[PDB]
Design an enzyme around this catalytic site. Sequence first.
Site, PDB file in Angstrom:
ATOM      1  N   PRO A  39       0.840  -1.202   0.000  1.00  0.00           N
ATOM      2  CA  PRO A  39       0.000   0.000   0.000  1.00  0.00           C
ATOM      3  C   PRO A  39       0.873   1.249   0.000  1.00  0.00           C
ATOM      4  O   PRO A  39       1.917   1.286   0.652  1.00  0.00           O
ATOM      5  CB  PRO A  39      -0.797  -0.115   1.306  1.00  0.00           C
ATOM      6  CG  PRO A  39      -0.565  -1.542   1.779  1.00  0.00           C
ATOM      7  CD  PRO A  39       0.836  -1.823   1.331  1.00  0.00           C
ATOM      8  N   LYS A  79      -2.564  -5.330   5.674  1.00  0.00           N
ATOM      9  CA  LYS A  79      -1.231  -5.667   5.188  1.00  0.00           C
ATOM     10  C   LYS A  79      -0.176  -5.325   6.239  1.00  0.00           C
ATOM     11  O   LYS A  79      -0.375  -4.428   7.058  1.00  0.00           O
ATOM     12  CB  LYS A  79      -0.941  -4.918   3.885  1.00  0.00           C
ATOM     13  CG  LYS A  79      -1.904  -5.281   2.758  1.00  0.00           C
ATOM     14  CD  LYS A  79      -1.566  -4.567   1.465  1.00  0.00           C
ATOM     15  CE  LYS A  79      -2.513  -4.976   0.342  1.00  0.00           C
ATOM     16  NZ  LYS A  79      -2.297  -6.385  -0.091  1.00  0.00           N
ATOM     17  N   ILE A 115      -2.489  -3.278  -3.812  1.00  0.00           N
ATOM     18  CA  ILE A 115      -2.734  -4.447  -4.642  1.00  0.00           C
ATOM     19  C   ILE A 115      -3.875  -5.134  -3.907  1.00  0.00           C
ATOM     20  O   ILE A 115      -3.659  -5.821  -2.906  1.00  0.00           O
ATOM     21  CB  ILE A 115      -1.507  -5.377  -4.696  1.00  0.00           C
ATOM     22  CG1 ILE A 115      -0.303  -4.610  -5.252  1.00  0.00           C
ATOM     23  CG2 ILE A 115      -1.813  -6.592  -5.573  1.00  0.00           C
ATOM     24  CD1 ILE A 115       0.980  -5.425  -5.321  1.00  0.00           C
ATOM     25  N   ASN A 129      -7.785   9.711  -4.170  1.00  0.00           N
ATOM     26  CA  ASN A 129      -7.950   8.850  -5.333  1.00  0.00           C
ATOM     27  C   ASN A 129      -7.495   7.457  -4.916  1.00  0.00           C
ATOM     28  O   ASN A 129      -6.387   7.291  -4.403  1.00  0.00           O
ATOM     29  CB  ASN A 129      -7.090   9.337  -6.504  1.00  0.00           C
ATOM     30  CG  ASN A 129      -7.705  10.519  -7.240  1.00  0.00           C
ATOM     31  OD1 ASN A 129      -6.991  11.383  -7.754  1.00  0.00           O
ATOM     32  ND2 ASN A 129      -9.029  10.553  -7.311  1.00  0.00           N
TER      33      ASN A 129
END
Lengths: 114, 114, 114
Positions: free
Chosen positions: A1, A32, A64, A97
């Site tokens: 991330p 994560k 991801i 975003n």
Amino acid sequence: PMFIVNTNVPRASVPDGFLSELTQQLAQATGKPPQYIAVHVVPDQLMAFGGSSEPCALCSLHSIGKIGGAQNRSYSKLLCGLLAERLRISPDRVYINYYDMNAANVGWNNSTFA
Amino acid sequence: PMFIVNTNVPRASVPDGFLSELTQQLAQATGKPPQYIAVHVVPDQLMAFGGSSEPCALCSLHSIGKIGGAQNRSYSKLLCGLLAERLRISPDRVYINYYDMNAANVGWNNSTFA
Amino acid sequence: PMFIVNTNVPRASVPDGFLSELTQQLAQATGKPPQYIAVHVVPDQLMAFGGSSEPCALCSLHSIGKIGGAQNRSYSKLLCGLLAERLRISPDRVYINYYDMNAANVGWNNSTFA
Ligand SMILES: *C(=S)NCCCC[S@@](C)=O
Ligand SMILES: *C(=S)NCCCC[S@@](C)=O
Ligand SMILES: [Cl-]
Ligand SMILES: [Cl-]
Ligand SMILES: [Cl-]
Ligand SMILES: [Cl-]
Ligand SMILES: [Cl-]
Ligand SMILES: [Cl-]
Ligand SMILES: [Cl-]
Ligand code: NA
Ligand code: NA
Ligand code: NA
Ligand code: NA
């Protein structure tokens, strides 16, 4: 991330440990390991939101997987909350975003995650 | 809509009203109220375009909709014109990455637009 | 092609001609003429990777085509190699987001590449 925050707020107003809190809270939020979380804070930027130069921020969260409708609303509440409490930026003057990256499109350690 | 410009031109060469001019022009171009538009200008950057360090710019235009082949060709004319006149950047040294964002992937005010 | 590097390493540690090296190396790796290649290096950033502030980097490579599983691994080896050699950044503290752009979404000189 990867979390990036661009803001017009001065560097001096970023509290000590802010990058550590972001790392820790994003690890919990994304699920994560914190070892793989990257954070980037960019203060003193020349920006405007709605034609106003009051405190604001433009951010990005790349990951991801772990990106989706419900998850993104949760990330937004978490991140806008931190920007409001720590940097004094109104939640309605922040854009984030979200990007769900394919493993093959994320380079690392002389290779990719694919 | 979110418009970001990264350029090697000096901060002193960026007009004080440039952010507001961009906001207003983009509001007309996207047909959205100026209030929804965010702008970010990053001067004094270490950049090269075509292996040259003359004035140049790498930009991004994000928007939930209002992005497309025809619309993008139009935005390029609008933005190149603004960068050319206000920042003195030749239009052939400007790149603009257009992003059509899903409402679910744009966070704002503790939530997303979905 | 557009290559951007965001790092916490000091500006002074960025070798003279680094931008030129990136331009030529990318021209070779992507096969595209250097005249169309854009490079952007941003040092002295406030960043953390794994919660640590040791040298690190967050990068982006945008390209119309020439993006893929094997190609991205190759780019990563090349770029991480350059960052390690020139900026002294460990390859396992570097992330590179790869973007395969649609020609219609890349604006340049009053139009797009479509
Ligand atoms: C954030 S983009 N971390 C990079 C990908 C990590 C792969 S597994 C260890 O989640
Ligand atoms: C530009 S990315 N604005 C984001 C969405 C603005 C609100 S919607 C109701 O147009
Ligand atoms: Cl979800
Ligand atoms: Cl992707
Ligand atoms: Cl269109
Ligand atoms: Cl999206
Ligand atoms: Cl930490
Ligand atoms: Cl490939
Ligand atoms: Cl695209
Ligand atoms: Na995606
Ligand atoms: Na998109
Ligand atoms: Na700066
Ligand atoms: Na793509």
